[PDB]
Amino acid sequence: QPLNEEFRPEMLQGKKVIVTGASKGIGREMAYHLAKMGAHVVVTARSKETLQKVVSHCLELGAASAHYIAGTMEDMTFAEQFVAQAGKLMGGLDMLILNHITNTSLNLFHDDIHHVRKSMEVNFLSYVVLTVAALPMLKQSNGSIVVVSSLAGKVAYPMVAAYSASKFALDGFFSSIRKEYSVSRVNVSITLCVLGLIDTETAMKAVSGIVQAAPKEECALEIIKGGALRQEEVYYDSSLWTTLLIRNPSRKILEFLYSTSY
Amino acid sequence: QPLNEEFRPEMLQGKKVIVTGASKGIGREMAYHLAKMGAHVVVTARSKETLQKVVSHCLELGAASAHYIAGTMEDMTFAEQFVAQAGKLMGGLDMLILNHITNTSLNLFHDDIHHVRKSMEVNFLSYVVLTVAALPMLKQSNGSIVVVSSLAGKVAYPMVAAYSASKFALDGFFSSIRKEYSVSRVNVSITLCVLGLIDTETAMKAVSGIVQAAPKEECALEIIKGGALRQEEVYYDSSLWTTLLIRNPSRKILEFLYS
Numbered sequence: 001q002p003l004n005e006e007f008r009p010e011m012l013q014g015k016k017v018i019v020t021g022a023s024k025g026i027g028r029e030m031a032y033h034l035a036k037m038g039a040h041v042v043v044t045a046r047s048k049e050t051l052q053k054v055v056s057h058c059l060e061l062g063a064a065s066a067h068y069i070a071g072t073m074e075d076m077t078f079a080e081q082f083v084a085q086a087g088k089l090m091g092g093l094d095m096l097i098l099n100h101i102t103n104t105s106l107n108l109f110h111d112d113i114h115h116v117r118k119s120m121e122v123n124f125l126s127y128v129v130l131t132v133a134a135l136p137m138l139k140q141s142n143g144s145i146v147v148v149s150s151l152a153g154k155v156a157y158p159m160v161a162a163y164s165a166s167k168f169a170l171d172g173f174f175s176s177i178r179k180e181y182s183v184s185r186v187n188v189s190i191t192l193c194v195l196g197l198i199d200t201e202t203a204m205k206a207v208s209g210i211v212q213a214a215p216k217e218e219c220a221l222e223i224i225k226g227g228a229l230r231q232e233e234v235y236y237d238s239s240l241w242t243t244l245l246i247r248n249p250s251r252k253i254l255e256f257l258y259s260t261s262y
Numbered sequence: 263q264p265l266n267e268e269f270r271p272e273m274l275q276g277k278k279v280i281v282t283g284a285s286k287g288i289g290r291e292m293a294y295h296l297a298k299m300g301a302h303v304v305v306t307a308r309s310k311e312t313l314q315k316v317v318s319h320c321l322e323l324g325a326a327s328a329h330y331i332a333g334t335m336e337d338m339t340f341a342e343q344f345v346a347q348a349g350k351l352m353g354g355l356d357m358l359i360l361n362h363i364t365n366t367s368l369n370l371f372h373d374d375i376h377h378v379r380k381s382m383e384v385n386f387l388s389y390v391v392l393t394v395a396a397l398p399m400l401k402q403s404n405g406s407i408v409v410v411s412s413l414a415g416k417v418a419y420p421m422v423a424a425y426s427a428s429k430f431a432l433d434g435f436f437s438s439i440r441k442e443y444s445v446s447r448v449n450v451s452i453t454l455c456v457l458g459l460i461d462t463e464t465a466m467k468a469v470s471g472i473v474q475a476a477p478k479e480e481c482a483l484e485i486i487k488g489g490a491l492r493q494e495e496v497y498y499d500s501s502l503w504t505t506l507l508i509r510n511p512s513r514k515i516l517e518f519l520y521s
């Protein structure tokens with residue numbers, strides 16, 4: 001049930017929200033936009049040094065409140081207590097933004113199984129664990145889940161096999177879960193975010209000299225809109241060529257066709 | 263780059279082939295077809311009992327050779343040793359059919375993270391391990407990798423989350439790997455197989471009274487035909503609406519866009 005209107009800041013006012021991989025890039029921006037709305041926000045990543053700043057600056061921007069908890073999403077235990085600790089900190093939760101990933105470079109896959117396992121653990125599994133942990137709270141506030149994926153998670157590219165495997169997984173898993181929430185009349189929206197190339201330090205470090213990326217600041221924003229407006233998918237890619245084709249009716253058809261079937 | 267000519271059982275004769283999850287269902291059928299064709303075959307799964315039955319039956323259908331090695335794909339050391347032992351049993355390798363999955367059922371997902379983790383380990387991760395271990399031989403023989411997937415690996419159904427996540431994963435990882443072989447000019451084809459409901463013991467059991475399945479023996483042959491013709495994708499379903507609906511050109515186009 002996507003909402004029948006457009007988005008304005010107030011919708012996030014005093015809304016308790018989690019953001020992962022929020023110490024830099026798209027994550028951080030999302031945190032900043034979030035403050036500019038006066039929402040409550042807890043943020044996480046590994047490094048406490050950078051998290052301290054994000055927290056400190058979100059207050060300036062006017063967040064109702066802002067805190068961090070550091071730990072590696074390599075660690076399902078941490079991911080599970082993180083959500084408990086944060087949500088109890090804020091006495092509830094309205095929107096879960098799953099954004100972090102393990103460190104990846106661009107290269108040929110070359111028998112790097114350990115890196116495929118780690119990608120799958122951090123980028124994909126941890127999202128599930130995180131969701132599991134928040135479901136009870138999200139049911140409470142008829143909240144929302146937002147999952148940051150890529151183009152590389154809808155179609156193929158070389159140089160990101162592990163990465164892509166994991167991004168594809170999110171789609172399969174969370175799109176499947178939606179249909180399940182529907183038929184169980186569970187009212188938690190789930191938004192998958194197909195993002196083209198974005199101007200983050202990390203991304204630009206690997207590209208730039210292979211060329212163009214969309215502005216990180218707006219990306220963060222569109223993500224936030226799609227999530228608040230409870231939309232199934234959000235696309236954000238600089239080239240309007242792309243944004244119009246990615247869609248895929250054969251699937252929407254095939255899914256819906258086999259829905260009223262049972 | 264797919265061969266541009268019909269296929270003939272003559273294409274698989276003397277071809278040395280591994281088939282995983284071949285004790286029952288689609289995998290068994292595949293082993294049988296390959297035997298009718300005179301290929302060499304090594305099959306695997308956990309149950310030695312059922313495997314013996316298969317092998318023995320394969321030697322009677324005419325396989326150039328036919329061995330088996332039982333093990334769980336839950337164990338990456340076994341996966342890696344399998345391919346070695348098999349390479350030696352056949353002195354090389356022409357095709358690798360990744361077909362096994364972990365047991366599953368149709369159920370709402372609450373918090374079975376260990377099942378999600380096992381699915382990803384067995385239905386996905388082992389394929390990578392297997393692929394990595396077989397790639398050298400396959401290189402030697404300009405061979406093929408055949409990965410068996412589903413509609414649920416291309417579109418979302420309720421009741422199969424873990425399963426889907428893993429099948430989707432195969433698409434992302436193998437389709438991406440396909441691109442890399444092309445820019446590396448590695449001559450080893452990769453075929454992803456998208457199947458609809460098939461009348462295997464397990465499937466029929468599971469969807470007993472909640473949902474027409476295709477014949478598993480014809481399916482088994484399509485898969486092999488797609489592999490030997492080096493097709494990127496095979497689509498097999500009882501509903502021809504479906505088989506034709508699934509192809510995804512808006513995607514093949516997009517991919518070429520940034521290429």
Ligand SMILES: NC(=O)c1ccc[n+]([C@@H]2O[C@H](COP(=O)([O-])OP(=O)(O)OC[C@H]3O[C@@H](n4cnc5c(N)ncnc54)[C@H](OP(=O)(O)O)[C@@H]3O)[C@@H](O)[C@H]2O)c1
Binds near residue numbers: 021098199203
């Ligand atoms: N930017 C792009 O070109 C692009 C394109 C498509 C999709 N996306 C998606 O957008 C999201 C963010 O991208 P980005 O470029 O903004 O990333 P980024 O700026 O490089 O930041 C990555 C974040 O994840 C954290 N992280 C790394 N390892 C972690 C771990 N083991 N446990 C917990 N956190 C960890 C990092 O903090 P620590 O190092 O301190 O842990 C950092 O905060 C990702 O989901 C990505 O897939 C990005």
Ligand SMILES: NC(=O)c1ccc[n+]([C@@H]2O[C@H](COP(=O)([O-])OP(=O)(O)OC[C@H]3O[C@@H](n4cnc5c(N)ncnc54)[C@H](OP(=O)(O)O)[C@@H]3O)[C@@H](O)[C@H]2O)c1
Binds near residue numbers: 308309334365462
């Ligand atoms: N049948 C369908 O409706 C359908 C639809 C779409 C896609 N597919 C795909 O087609 C393929 C085969 O399906 P199927 O229905 O033929 O399956 P199946 O008959 O149930 O056979 C599964 C095989 O995998 C083996 N296996 C199970 N757990 C294992 C483990 N831990 N380690 C190693 N092997 C294990 C089983 O033998 P052991 O228990 O002895 O190990 C068995 O040989 C799968 O990739 C499936 O996803 C099937």
Ligand SMILES: C[C@](O)(c1ccc(C(=O)N(C2CC2)[C@H]2CC[C@H](c3cccnc3)CC2)cc1)C(F)(F)F
Binds near residue numbers: 149
């Ligand atoms: C983590 C990282 O920053 C990263 C990973 C994946 C994507 C990503 O989602 N892609 C955009 C959405 C498609 C990639 C862009 C570059 C593409 C590429 C790289 C090299 C060669 N050909 C294509 C791969 C997909 C962006 C950044 C990386 F890889 F370190 F740069």
Ligand SMILES: C[C@](O)(c1ccc(C(=O)N(C2CC2)[C@H]2CC[C@H](c3cccnc3)CC2)cc1)C(F)(F)F
Binds near residue numbers: 262365412414458473
């Ligand atoms: C292993 C198993 O036998 C199985 C799993 C998945 C699929 C599969 O790939 N599907 C076909 C390709 C789509 C399923 C068909 C039924 C679908 C479904 C289930 C419940 C309600 N509506 C549709 C779920 C995917 C087939 C068998 C199972 F799950 F035990 F039944």
